[PDB]
Ligand binder design. Structure first.
Ligand SMILES: c1cnc2cc3c(cc2n1)[C@@H]1CNC[C@H]3C1
Length: 278
């Protein structure tokens, strides 16, 4: 009579916004109440938590990215097209873990390598290969998740033979300040990052196609769907409802304009008519 589900996120702006959207949709369209949980860390943290489940100090639902799941299935970085990534993780997670991938939200939040526009013009940079030829002169500032993830810098560095003068691990917001001030020359910008809006940066082309697609989708434990089958349709109301530009704008409302992510998520859903006004 008082059933609850746990929606998890790791700790970054987009993750919390989209987890909040999932929680708001569930509470708007079902009789379930939602525990919102934040998990410390990056790679495989939400995956392990959902394997435990909300009844065992874990989570029942979170928004995963196809490429992050794909690299864990394969055991080595590989590239593919959006459908290849999505269908592979959907079938594998269902068969191995009884985890259900719902429909993609609509955006691809990939890792990138990004430089200031002026630096790109100064050195004629368009591609990762262009950058690698001169990386020995440059400093990379990047997030811990990118530097430590199996699908992040370790394999990219080996494939392109990147040789930066110095490589610094940085918090998410401050790497944008650091590249704006030329404390570093390259950052691992993420494609939906809010602060890409306010900095004059150039996203370089991954010409060897190292990275897989990173399409966000809600995923849920099958036993939670068995108990509450309505969830499937409710969460699929978000299907293709968030473009890259929309997600970027929401992220900037938090990171650039100081709004809290709960407010940003709820007002977005109200604007799009996905939940009721008032
Ligand atoms: C480990 C686990 N999940 C991640 C999710 C994301 C990232 C890194 C992760 N690393 C950023 C790049 N892909 C989508 C977001 C943001």
């Amino acid at each position: 009579a008082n059933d609850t589900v746990v929606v998890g996120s790791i700790i970054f702006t987009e993750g919390i916004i989209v987890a909040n959207m999932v929680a708001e949709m569930i509470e708007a369209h079902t009789d379930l109440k939602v525990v919102r949980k934040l998990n410390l860390g990056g790679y495989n943290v939400n995956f392990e938590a959902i394997k435990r489940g909300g009844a065992n100090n874990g989570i029942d639902i979170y928004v995963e990215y196809t490429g992050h799941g794909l690299v864990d299935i394969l055991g080595f970085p590989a590239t593919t097209d959006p459908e290849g990534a999505y269908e592979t993780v959907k079938k594998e997670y269902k068969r191995k873990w009884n985890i259900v991938w719902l429909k993609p939200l609509g955006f691809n939040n990939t890792y990138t390598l990004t430089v200031k526009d002026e630096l790109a013009k100064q050195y004629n940079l368009k591609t990762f290969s262009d950058l690698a030829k001169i990386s020995d002169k440059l400093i990379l500032g990047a997030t811990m998740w990118f530097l430590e993830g199996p699908d992040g810098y370790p394999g990219l560095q080996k494939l392109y033979n990147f040789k930066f003068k110095h490589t610094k691990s940085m918090d998410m917001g401050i790497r944008y300040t650091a590249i704006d001030n030329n404390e570093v020359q390259v950052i691992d910008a993420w494609a939906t990052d809010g602060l890409l809006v306010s900095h004059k940066l150039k996203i370089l082309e991954d010409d060897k196609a190292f990275f897989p697609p990173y399409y966000a989708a809600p995923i849920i434990r099958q036993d939670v769907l068995d108990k509450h089958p309505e969830l499937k349709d409710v969460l699929n109301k978000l299907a293709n409802q968030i473009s890259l530009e929309e997600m970027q704008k929401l992220n900037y409302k938090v990171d650039g304009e100081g709004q809290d992510p709960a407010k940003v998520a709820k007002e977005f859903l109200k604007e799009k008519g996905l939940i009721l006004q008032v």
